[PDB]
Amino acid sequence: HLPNITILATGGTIAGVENLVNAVPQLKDIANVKGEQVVNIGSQDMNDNVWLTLAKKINTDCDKTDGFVITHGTDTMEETAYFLDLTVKCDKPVVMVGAMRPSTSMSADGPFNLYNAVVTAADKASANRGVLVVMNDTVLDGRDVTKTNTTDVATFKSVNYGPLGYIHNGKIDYQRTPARKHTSDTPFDVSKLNELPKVGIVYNYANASDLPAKALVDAGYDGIVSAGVGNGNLYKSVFDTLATAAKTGTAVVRSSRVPTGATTQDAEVDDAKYGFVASGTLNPQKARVLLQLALTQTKDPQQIQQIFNQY
Amino acid sequence: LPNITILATGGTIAGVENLVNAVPQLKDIANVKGEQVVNIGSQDMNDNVWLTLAKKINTDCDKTDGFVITHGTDTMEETAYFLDLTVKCDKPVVMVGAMRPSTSMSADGPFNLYNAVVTAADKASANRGVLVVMNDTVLDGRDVTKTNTTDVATFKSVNYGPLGYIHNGKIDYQRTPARKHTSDTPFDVSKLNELPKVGIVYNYANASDLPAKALVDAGYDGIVSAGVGNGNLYKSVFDTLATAAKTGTAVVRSSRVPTGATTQDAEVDDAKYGFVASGTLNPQKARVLLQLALTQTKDPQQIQQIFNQY
Amino acid sequence: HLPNITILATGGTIAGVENLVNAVPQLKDIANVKGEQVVNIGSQDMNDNVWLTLAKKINTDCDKTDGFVITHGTDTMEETAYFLDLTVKCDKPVVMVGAMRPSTSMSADGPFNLYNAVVTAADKASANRGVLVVMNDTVLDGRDVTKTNTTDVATFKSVNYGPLGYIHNGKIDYQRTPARKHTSDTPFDVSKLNELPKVGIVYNYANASDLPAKALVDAGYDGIVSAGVGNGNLYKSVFDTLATAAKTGTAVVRSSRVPTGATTQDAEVDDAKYGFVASGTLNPQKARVLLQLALTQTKDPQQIQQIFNQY
Amino acid sequence: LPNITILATGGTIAGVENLVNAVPQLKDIANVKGEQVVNIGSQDMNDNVWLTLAKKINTDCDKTDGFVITHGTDTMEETAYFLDLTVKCDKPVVMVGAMRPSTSMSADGPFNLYNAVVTAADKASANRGVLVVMNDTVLDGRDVTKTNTTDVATFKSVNYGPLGYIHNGKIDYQRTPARKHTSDTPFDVSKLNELPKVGIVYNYANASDLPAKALVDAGYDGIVSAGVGNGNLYKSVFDTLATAAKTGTAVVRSSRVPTGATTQDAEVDDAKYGFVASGTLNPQKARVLLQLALTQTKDPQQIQQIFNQY
């Protein structure tokens, strides 16, 4: 008896959706695989509608399978993974996987990546660890995982807290699990939502224009995430715009363009004075995910900060 | 002992005249003179300070043996690259800051400043471009970047590595940047009062096109895209920047991904759209080169050549 | 009411033992500190006797304090930390700390390192995580922590599974804990031992002499750890000597000189055929610690392998 | 197309004559000829193979445009440095291997070999020393090391970084090693049948002196210490090596620590004891340089100078 694993595809094939058991025939040795094409897009075009589709599908079909593998482009896999980490209520394994080389190229990584993703989704030890990303023989938690390099097959790393386990010869030695609350331990419930609160991201740098921030404010955005410099700092003109926005109903989260480390609460910005929230180790795109979901529950900055301290 | 000028741009990391008293060991390695150029937090760094610093270094080159610039860490990597392209003095120019306040336990500023002066005093530091010295390491201004929000070891040359390490006041240099810098560039800011307007837009799932449209509507000369993966763009952002490029806006594809190049000949046909690929330059560094490129040319093929040489 | 923290010193001072509350006066704000000089040596001379002294002291004095900080040289801190991780039965916090710069040098790291070590030992959340190392604002588990650079203040990293938490403004956000069994979950009990089994380490490289391995065998060593090349591979002459030793009573553990990754069981060496044990992610010096302790319980290679799979 | 010679030292990574059939895309970039020099696992690499490879490359230099050497990954970093010091051909010499078996899913060997040939065919690769090409990256033979036991991305130049990255068959080189290599070294193995005996001892808590004593008793010409921290030694190991140095044994302090230099002027008075500090050379790389140094001199001051130049 092998586990039933459902592959949900979101784009092109990473090996070579119903043909994957022929493209990677050794999947037969580890699982009974069934494939469904959910959508077909490049992940640079990933969007809220696809996120809601995936969460609802996994939650609806949880009782019909033993685990899920989602094939997904690498560019925004880290965003989808965290969205699902917060909204999936199935605690069976949910594993995302992609490929940094075309499936037609020399030494394509897709085939073995898919094999190892199925290994992970079939391992009972993978349950209750949240939504996972499996790339380059490594199991990574959906919160901390990020794409660190533009081209390397080894690009995906959990840059602050490290991987959960390594895969060798079809076996995983798990030595870690994420302590932040995920899946069925979060209050986020998207089962009935057709849309998510509007949250945009602005970058900070020398001489930064306030026009991007102002355009999101003019459009009535529900939240703005700042990709700050250093420990979440803001260029003066951007600071001025976001200070006004926070006092007129917009939720403002300070994150950082710096690729590792937390944007902390007790540094150079008096968040309580301005009504801002500090993102911790969540990078701008991950902080956007959590802020959108926070905004389904509350608009209060103190309550949003508590959310950013727990999930 | 060599004469070293410390140009301060903010608060102390260890008045500016007092640094020899804060770090008395500096007297054993250099004759130090300090000047306060501006006094701002580096999160508020801007074009006017960049122009002031380049002009000052170029004007005072003959008056000193080397320069150390004290600077906040948040945007040091941007100022370093700007100076790397516009300074024509080939005497050492070294930037330094501190990740812990000078008043805090185990403050890093004192030894960082000591090592920055060591570097500026070392004859072997000349002709290597503008340098950043942090955590016992000499880093080239092009590749150096702040990798962590809090760690004293945050500054790293994440693609090509450091130039040398400092131990007991001595540097073993094993590398130098091949990209053209300082007097090997055509960028000459000596007579400029302002720089071309270049903004940065971020890409992510469901990204709004409104930031890009706002820069276009303001007549920006260039826009850098902090793309996903190998410089890819969310569809609506792509569409806005493609239309803008047809009108003459310079568009550089960079990446929010912290290491690796945004390459030509990947998923985006840059020649078709009139875009430029930034290579290993991250968004804020690509902005620096794009502003300077736009002092010379608006033509995308020529801008691409600049992004392949500097 | 502040916690009672005991500082156990093993060498020179890292800040500036009873004077430390004067060298770092802000310790008064976070703990009631008492210091004891256990030994006074450079950690390059660390040895079994000091290890046994420390474990027995912590176990004896557990009920007299709220947590422990051990000041220790950096060169072998990673070895002592893992030894204590396996032998301490006090589940109150035990934190090791050192300094990469002299306490008299510019920007000495010792003072703040000690402050943060006391913060960690005083945090109730630090309990039950095993023996810890606190360096450069980071809390690291004793198993995976290793010295990665010869001079950098940021040298200590948990290179396979990452840190447990980061320290900012005297507060720790713990997001991980080690899954391998430690402290009171191990069977290793050194309370009555005056000596440990003899275990030496041999290096592998091109053209490697068998003479180091032969000298340990001739001396009747109880175990030998190989610092293998790649995934625990051995130069032919070293392989030949260790194959003979394993069949004549010596325990042989394959580790690797490679600084990250596991020496795995199902690679190029048939460990069952030769009676060898694979060390997993334990580097040679850490594998020595566990092998010495395994040898207090058993000489059987299969049982030693199980130990290397659980601790 | 350039003529590239593939010298194989073990099993295939993608007979040796068949590589153009395993990787047909090689025909689009080079005229490839293969020769099997030896057939061993690289964990069994040894002095005789090193001498064979250096002599073969030096003899056949005029007959080809570049060399690729296929080699096991376990000791590739040692062979690369040996060749980096002894090859006098300044045409490209590139080493390559594979972390996954050629028969396994997503085997890395095929593309690694393709990129190695790209590198050997690129005129810009010349005069950079012996190179290792792995995971789309060109790495200098001195600093390159295997950092992980299993990862395809294991090879990194952990102190000074890579020389260039390979994308779509093109290399952007931004660095070159400053330490002297190839024809800038005095090491000449053309007439040597053997190399001086150099062994490596490890340091750790409670370390036995018996390994060191065994090498001394065998009359080893040199011993490298894999020290703790900045090249420190356990007392009993120290005492044995100090006595041996007084008798003429060459002793190099390296470090088991995987990055950073073993420096002069730290905790060990090298001049007093007659020891040599290895710098950034790890134990196995320090052995390579020490063996070659001992073909020229037994004097510790001269050996230290060699460790400061190569």
Side-chain angles (χ1 to χ4, degrees), chain A residues 2-246 248-311, chain B residues 1-16 18-26 28-310, chain C residues 2-246 248-311, chain D residues 1-16 18-26 28-310:
Chain A
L2 297 172
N4 296 326
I5 299 299
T6 297
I7 299 180
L8 301 181
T10 67
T13 189
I14 70 174
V17 67
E18 290 149 62
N19 198 68
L20 285 173
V21 297
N22 286 350
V24 187
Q26 307 84 357
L27 294 181
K28 74 176 158 51
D29 302 345
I30 53 173
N32 298 304
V33 178
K34 169 201 99 102
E36 305 189 52
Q37 190 81 40
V38 168
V39 299
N40 183 29
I41 60 162
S43 83
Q44 79 283 356
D45 292 338
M46 188 52 52
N47 59 66
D48 291 355
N49 289 330
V50 177
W51 284 0
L52 287 166
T53 300
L54 287 166
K56 291 174 190 181
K57 174 85 162 171
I58 290 164
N59 289 333
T60 293
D61 291 0
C62 187
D63 280 327
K64 309 170 189 159
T65 190
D66 298 319
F68 294 88
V69 171
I70 307 172
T71 60
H72 192 284
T74 62
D75 290 354
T76 65
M77 181 156 55
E78 74 193 77
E79 300 176 51
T80 307
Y82 188 43
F83 177 86
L84 295 177
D85 203 24
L86 295 170
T87 58
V88 165
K89 307 298 172 175
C90 193
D91 276 309
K92 305 188 185 174
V94 178
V95 176
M96 308 197 60
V97 66
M100 289 295 286
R101 295 171 178 161
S103 64
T104 56
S105 71
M106 288 175 280
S107 299
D109 54 323
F112 196 45
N113 279 346
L114 178 61
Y115 185 86
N116 276 340
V118 173
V119 167
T120 301
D123 186 351
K124 58 181 192 209
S126 300
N128 293 299
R129 298 190 190 260
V131 173
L132 306 172
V133 171
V134 170
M135 292 292 282
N136 195 44
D137 310 350
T138 312
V139 186
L140 306 148
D141 79 274
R143 187 182 199 275
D144 202 39
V145 65
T146 184
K147 184 170 187 172
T148 69
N149 186 270
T150 52
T151 57
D152 191 335
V153 296
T155 186
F156 285 96
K157 297 289 209 297
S158 282
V159 297
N160 298 294
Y161 295 101
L164 306 186
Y166 294 93
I167 310 175
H168 177 78
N169 191 32
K171 294 296 225 209
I172 307 171
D173 181 22
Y174 277 115
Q175 294 202 21
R176 297 293 203 275
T177 199
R180 289 275 172 141
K181 290 178 168 174
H182 53 70
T183 58
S184 54
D185 291 328
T186 86
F188 307 117
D189 174 3
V190 299
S191 60
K192 298 169 186 44
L193 295 182
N194 294 311
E195 73 201 4
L196 295 170
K198 285 173 306 228
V199 172
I201 304 179
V202 297
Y203 209 71
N204 290 262
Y205 52 97
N207 218 105
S209 178
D210 61 12
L211 292 168
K214 285 175 161 179
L216 298 175
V217 171
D218 289 346
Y221 260 58
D222 302 297
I224 302 169
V225 172
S226 171
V229 296
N231 192 351
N233 288 315
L234 297 110
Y235 182 72
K236 56 197 178 263
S237 310
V238 180
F239 204 146
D240 289 344
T241 294
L242 293 184
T244 299
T248 74
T250 307
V252 174
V253 168
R254 298 192 301 105
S255 180
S256 181
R257 76 187 188 177
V258 178
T260 75
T263 295
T264 63
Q265 294 175 244
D266 309 298
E268 286 183 68
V269 182
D270 189 341
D271 289 313
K273 172 183 195 218
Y274 295 105
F276 294 163
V277 170
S279 71
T281 65
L282 297 175
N283 69 29
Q285 56 271 19
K286 304 254 192 189
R288 164 173 181 276
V289 167
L290 184 57
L291 184 56
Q292 284 189 294
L293 292 168
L295 286 163
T296 71
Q297 305 253 316
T298 180
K299 316 300 156 156
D300 178 76
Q302 286 174 277
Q303 292 188 327
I304 295 173
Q305 185 67 78
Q306 291 305 323
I307 287 169
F308 272 78
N309 294 346
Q310 296 181 104
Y311 309 99
Chain B
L1 297 179
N3 296 322
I4 299 300
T5 298
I6 298 177
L7 302 180
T9 67
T12 181
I13 67 172
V16 73
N18 202 34
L19 286 168
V20 290
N21 291 329
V23 192
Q25 301 95 329
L26 293 177
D28 293 323
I29 55 172
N31 299 305
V32 168
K33 171 230 279 173
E35 318 182 33
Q36 190 84 39
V37 176
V38 289
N39 182 30
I40 58 164
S42 85
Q43 77 283 356
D44 292 332
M45 189 53 53
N46 59 73
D47 292 354
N48 295 329
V49 175
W50 285 359
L51 289 168
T52 299
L53 284 168
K55 291 173 187 180
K56 173 82 165 164
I57 290 164
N58 289 334
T59 293
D60 294 357
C61 187
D62 292 349
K63 310 189 180 111
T64 188
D65 297 321
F67 294 90
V68 171
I69 307 173
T70 62
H71 193 287
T73 62
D74 291 353
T75 61
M76 183 156 55
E77 74 194 74
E78 296 174 55
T79 307
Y81 187 45
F82 179 84
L83 297 178
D84 202 27
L85 296 169
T86 60
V87 162
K88 308 298 172 174
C89 191
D90 274 309
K91 304 186 189 183
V93 176
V94 179
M95 310 202 57
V96 66
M99 288 295 283
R100 297 176 177 155
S102 60
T103 50
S104 69
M105 191 166 350
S106 299
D108 54 326
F111 195 44
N112 278 349
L113 180 60
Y114 183 84
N115 279 337
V117 174
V118 169
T119 304
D122 184 352
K123 76 193 175 182
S125 301
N127 295 294
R128 296 190 190 259
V130 173
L131 306 174
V132 170
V133 172
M134 291 293 279
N135 196 43
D136 317 344
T137 313
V138 184
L139 307 147
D140 81 271
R142 186 181 201 275
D143 203 37
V144 64
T145 183
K146 187 170 180 170
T147 68
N148 186 270
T149 54
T150 56
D151 192 336
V152 296
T154 184
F155 285 94
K156 299 179 168 324
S157 284
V158 297
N159 299 293
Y160 296 101
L163 304 189
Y165 295 94
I166 313 175
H167 181 263
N168 189 39
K170 301 189 262 184
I171 308 174
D172 182 21
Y173 277 115
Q174 294 200 24
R175 294 296 200 275
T176 197
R179 287 277 171 141
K180 285 173 165 170
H181 55 70
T182 59
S183 55
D184 293 328
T185 88
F187 309 117
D188 174 3
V189 300
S190 58
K191 297 174 187 53
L192 292 183
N193 303 125
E194 64 180 63
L195 295 170
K197 291 182 181 49
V198 173
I200 301 177
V201 297
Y202 209 71
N203 292 257
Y204 51 98
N206 219 109
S208 177
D209 66 6
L210 293 171
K213 287 183 165 336
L215 297 173
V216 173
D217 286 345
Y220 262 57
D221 301 297
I223 302 170
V224 175
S225 168
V228 297
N230 194 349
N232 288 321
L233 298 94
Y234 186 72
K235 185 176 194 314
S236 72
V237 180
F238 197 123
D239 288 346
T240 291
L241 293 182
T243 297
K246 292 284 182 175
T247 84
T249 305
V251 175
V252 170
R253 298 192 304 108
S254 181
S255 181
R256 74 183 192 184
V257 176
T259 75
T262 295
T263 67
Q264 306 172 254
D265 310 306
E267 272 177 81
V268 179
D269 186 344
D270 290 311
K272 175 169 173 176
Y273 294 106
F275 292 168
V276 168
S278 75
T280 61
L281 294 175
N282 71 26
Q284 57 270 20
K285 303 245 195 197
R287 168 171 177 275
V288 168
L289 184 58
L290 182 56
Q291 287 187 293
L292 287 170
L294 286 163
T295 70
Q296 307 250 314
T297 179
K298 299 91 218 155
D299 174 73
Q301 285 171 282
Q302 298 189 324
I303 296 173
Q304 185 67 78
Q305 286 313 310
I306 284 162
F307 271 77
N308 294 346
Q309 295 178 89
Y310 309 97
Chain C
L2 297 172
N4 296 326
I5 299 299
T6 297
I7 299 180
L8 301 181
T10 67
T13 189
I14 70 174
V17 67
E18 290 149 62
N19 198 68
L20 285 173
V21 297
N22 286 350
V24 187
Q26 307 84 357
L27 294 181
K28 74 176 158 51
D29 302 345
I30 53 173
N32 298 304
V33 178
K34 169 201 99 102
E36 305 189 52
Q37 190 81 40
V38 168
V39 299
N40 183 29
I41 60 162
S43 83
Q44 79 283 356
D45 292 338
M46 188 52 52
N47 59 66
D48 291 355
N49 289 330
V50 177
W51 284 0
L52 287 166
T53 300
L54 287 166
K56 291 174 190 181
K57 174 85 162 171
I58 290 164
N59 289 333
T60 293
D61 291 0
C62 187
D63 280 327
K64 309 170 189 159
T65 190
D66 298 319
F68 294 88
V69 171
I70 307 172
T71 60
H72 192 284
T74 62
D75 290 354
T76 65
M77 181 156 55
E78 74 193 77
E79 300 176 51
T80 307
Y82 188 43
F83 177 86
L84 295 177
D85 203 24
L86 295 170
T87 58
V88 165
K89 307 298 172 175
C90 193
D91 276 309
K92 305 188 185 174
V94 178
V95 176
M96 308 197 60
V97 66
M100 289 295 286
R101 295 171 178 161
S103 64
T104 56
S105 71
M106 288 175 280
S107 299
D109 54 323
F112 196 45
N113 279 346
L114 178 61
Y115 185 86
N116 276 340
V118 173
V119 167
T120 301
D123 186 351
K124 58 181 192 209
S126 300
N128 293 299
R129 298 190 190 260
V131 173
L132 306 172
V133 171
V134 170
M135 292 292 282
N136 195 44
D137 310 350
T138 312
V139 186
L140 306 148
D141 79 274
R143 187 182 199 275
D144 202 39
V145 65
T146 184
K147 184 170 187 172
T148 69
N149 186 270
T150 52
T151 57
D152 191 335
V153 296
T155 186
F156 285 96
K157 297 289 209 297
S158 282
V159 297
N160 298 294
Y161 295 101
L164 306 186
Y166 294 93
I167 310 175
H168 177 78
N169 191 32
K171 294 296 225 209
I172 307 171
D173 181 22
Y174 277 115
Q175 294 202 21
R176 297 293 203 275
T177 199
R180 289 275 172 141
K181 290 178 168 174
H182 53 70
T183 58
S184 54
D185 291 328
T186 86
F188 307 117
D189 174 3
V190 299
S191 60
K192 298 169 186 44
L193 295 182
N194 294 311
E195 73 201 4
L196 295 170
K198 285 173 306 228
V199 172
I201 304 179
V202 297
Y203 209 71
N204 290 262
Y205 52 97
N207 218 105
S209 178
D210 61 12
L211 292 168
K214 285 175 161 179
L216 298 175
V217 171
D218 289 346
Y221 260 58
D222 302 297
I224 302 169
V225 172
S226 171
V229 296
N231 192 351
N233 288 315
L234 297 110
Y235 182 72
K236 56 197 178 263
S237 310
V238 180
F239 204 146
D240 289 344
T241 294
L242 293 184
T244 299
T248 74
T250 307
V252 174
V253 168
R254 298 192 301 105
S255 180
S256 181
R257 76 187 188 177
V258 178
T260 75
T263 295
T264 63
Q265 294 175 244
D266 309 298
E268 286 183 68
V269 182
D270 189 341
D271 289 313
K273 172 183 195 218
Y274 295 105
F276 294 163
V277 170
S279 71
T281 65
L282 297 175
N283 69 29
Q285 56 271 19
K286 304 254 192 189
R288 164 173 181 276
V289 167
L290 184 57
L291 184 56
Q292 284 189 294
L293 292 168
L295 286 163
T296 71
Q297 305 253 316
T298 180
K299 316 300 156 156
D300 178 76
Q302 286 174 277
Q303 292 188 327
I304 295 173
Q305 185 67 78
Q306 291 305 323
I307 287 169
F308 272 78
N309 294 346
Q310 296 181 104
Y311 309 99
Chain D
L1 297 179
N3 296 322
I4 299 300
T5 298
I6 298 177
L7 302 180
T9 67
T12 181
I13 67 172
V16 73
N18 202 34
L19 286 168
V20 290
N21 291 329
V23 192
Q25 301 95 329
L26 293 177
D28 293 323
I29 55 172
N31 299 305
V32 168
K33 171 230 279 173
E35 318 182 33
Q36 190 84 39
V37 176
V38 289
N39 182 30
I40 58 164
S42 85
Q43 77 283 356
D44 292 332
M45 189 53 53
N46 59 73
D47 292 354
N48 295 329
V49 175
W50 285 359
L51 289 168
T52 299
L53 284 168
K55 291 173 187 180
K56 173 82 165 164
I57 290 164
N58 289 334
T59 293
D60 294 357
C61 187
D62 292 349
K63 310 189 180 111
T64 188
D65 297 321
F67 294 90
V68 171
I69 307 173
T70 62
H71 193 287
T73 62
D74 291 353
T75 61
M76 183 156 55
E77 74 194 74
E78 296 174 55
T79 307
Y81 187 45
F82 179 84
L83 297 178
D84 202 27
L85 296 169
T86 60
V87 162
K88 308 298 172 174
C89 191
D90 274 309
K91 304 186 189 183
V93 176
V94 179
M95 310 202 57
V96 66
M99 288 295 283
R100 297 176 177 155
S102 60
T103 50
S104 69
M105 191 166 350
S106 299
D108 54 326
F111 195 44
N112 278 349
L113 180 60
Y114 183 84
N115 279 337
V117 174
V118 169
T119 304
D122 184 352
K123 76 193 175 182
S125 301
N127 295 294
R128 296 190 190 259
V130 173
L131 306 174
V132 170
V133 172
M134 291 293 279
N135 196 43
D136 317 344
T137 313
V138 184
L139 307 147
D140 81 271
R142 186 181 201 275
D143 203 37
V144 64
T145 183
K146 187 170 180 170
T147 68
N148 186 270
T149 54
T150 56
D151 192 336
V152 296
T154 184
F155 285 94
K156 299 179 168 324
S157 284
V158 297
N159 299 293
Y160 296 101
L163 304 189
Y165 295 94
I166 313 175
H167 181 263
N168 189 39
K170 301 189 262 184
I171 308 174
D172 182 21
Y173 277 115
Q174 294 200 24
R175 294 296 200 275
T176 197
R179 287 277 171 141
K180 285 173 165 170
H181 55 70
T182 59
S183 55
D184 293 328
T185 88
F187 309 117
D188 174 3
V189 300
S190 58
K191 297 174 187 53
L192 292 183
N193 303 125
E194 64 180 63
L195 295 170
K197 291 182 181 49
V198 173
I200 301 177
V201 297
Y202 209 71
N203 292 257
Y204 51 98
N206 219 109
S208 177
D209 66 6
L210 293 171
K213 287 183 165 336
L215 297 173
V216 173
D217 286 345
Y220 262 57
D221 301 297
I223 302 170
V224 175
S225 168
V228 297
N230 194 349
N232 288 321
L233 298 94
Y234 186 72
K235 185 176 194 314
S236 72
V237 180
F238 197 123
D239 288 346
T240 291
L241 293 182
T243 297
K246 292 284 182 175
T247 84
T249 305
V251 175
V252 170
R253 298 192 304 108
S254 181
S255 181
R256 74 183 192 184
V257 176
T259 75
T262 295
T263 67
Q264 306 172 254
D265 310 306
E267 272 177 81
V268 179
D269 186 344
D270 290 311
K272 175 169 173 176
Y273 294 106
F275 292 168
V276 168
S278 75
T280 61
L281 294 175
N282 71 26
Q284 57 270 20
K285 303 245 195 197
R287 168 171 177 275
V288 168
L289 184 58
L290 182 56
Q291 287 187 293
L292 287 170
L294 286 163
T295 70
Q296 307 250 314
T297 179
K298 299 91 218 155
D299 174 73
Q301 285 171 282
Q302 298 189 324
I303 296 173
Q304 185 67 78
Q305 286 313 310
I306 284 162
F307 271 77
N308 294 346
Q309 295 178 89
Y310 309 97

